[PDB]
Amino acid sequence: SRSLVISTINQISEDSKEFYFTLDNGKTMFPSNSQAWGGEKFENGQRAFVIFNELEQPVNGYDYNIQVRDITKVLTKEIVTMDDEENTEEKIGDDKINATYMWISKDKKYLTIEFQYYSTHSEDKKHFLNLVINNKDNTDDEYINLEFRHNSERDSPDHLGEGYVSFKLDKIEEQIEGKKGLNIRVRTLYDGIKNYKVQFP
């Protein structure tokens, strides 16, 4: 029977066609049919939803041996630092968005957000999502302050939709040591500005 997970696509070998999956609990999956995605060059660190069948036979060095049915990429982005020239209020935007569900992977490499916002649901009008370090008593010594920003690019807020975005936490890797988690500023859909604390596993 079918299985579904979110995972990191690992592309570390010299053959860019050879890849495996890392789950947010640290466990790994070996795709016995990864060759079928041979035309699809996946970047190392790419996040994706994977539909698969778990095979009975184990493969040495991997927790799972799987037959992949579908790989659907999850928007994977870097944090927008203070020094970035693209870190402008105009480019980043501050449109409403809901952070429905958030979690950090065991290795503290990703913050994934299940979000909801209103759009016209058209490929022509793309929305811009970012995890930003703002350039301008608080618990800054326990939680790292970040802003989950949304630029709707003037799209009419007609229909509610859901999605996922995964952010690499490597640009704040030095600060993670000795902190409880992340403090995420969100301009919510119905309740104004909220600050959500997301714990490191």
Residues 35 and 86 in one domain: no
Residue 66 · residue 29 · CB < 8 Å: yes
DSSP line for the chain: -EEEEEEEEE--SSSTT--EEEETTS-EEEETTGGGGTTS-PPTT-EEEEEEEE-SS--TT-SEEEEEEEEEEEEEEE-B-TT-TT--HHHH-----EEEEEEE-TTS-EEEEEEEEEE---TTS--EEEEE-------TTTEEEEEEEEE-TT----EEEEEEEEEE-GGGHHHHTT--EEEEEEE-SSS-EEEEEEE--
Question: 50 is in which domain, residue-wise?
Answer: 1-73
- Number of structural domains found in the chain: 2
Of 17, 44, 73, the residue at which a domain comes to its end is: 73
| CATH number of the structural domain spanning residue 129 | 2.60.40.2370
Pairing of strands 128-132, 143-151: antiparallel
The experimental technique used to determine this model is: X-ray
Residues 64 and 111 in one domain: no
| Spatial distance between the Cα atoms of 145 and 96, rounded to a whole number of angstroms | 19
CA atoms within 13 A on the CB side of 117: 30
Residues 45 and 89 in one domain: no
Of 73, 88, 111, the residue at which a domain comes to its end is: 73
Residue 110 · residue 168 · CB < 8 Å: yes
| CATH number of the structural domain spanning residue 41 | 2.40.50.500
Residue 23 · residue 54 · CB < 8 Å: no
Residues 172 and 78 in one domain: yes
Amino acid letter at 132? Answer: V
Q: Pick from 1, 6, 4: which is nearest to 114 by CA?
A: 6
Q: Pick from 43, 54, 51: which is nearest to 8 by CA?
A: 43
| Spatial distance between the Cα atoms of 91 and 86, rounded to a whole number of angstroms | 6
Phi first, then psi: give them for residue 150, nearest 5 degrees.
Answer: -130, 130
Residues 48 and 86 in one domain: no
Residues 60 and 135 in one domain: no
DSSP line for 83-103: T-TT--HHHH-----EEEEEE
Residue 190 CA: distances (Å) to CA of 8, 114, 133, 187: 32, 17, 24, 9
Residues 102 and 68 in one domain: no
Residues 166 and 111 in one domain: yes
Order the strands of the 128-132 sheet from edge to edge. 128-132, 143-151, 181-187, 193-199
Count CB atoms within 10 A of the CB of residue 131: 23
Residues 165 and 103 in one domain: yes
Token pair of 140, please?
């800054």
Amino acid letter at 20? Answer: Y
Beta bridge partners of 67: 53
Resolution stated for this PDB structure, in Å:
2.4
Residues 135 and 157 in one domain: yes
Q: Residue 114: left (phi > 0), alpha (psi -120 to 50), or beta?
A: beta
Of 38, 73, 108, the residue at which a domain comes to its end is: 73
**Residue found by looking up tokens 């041979």 in the block:** 38
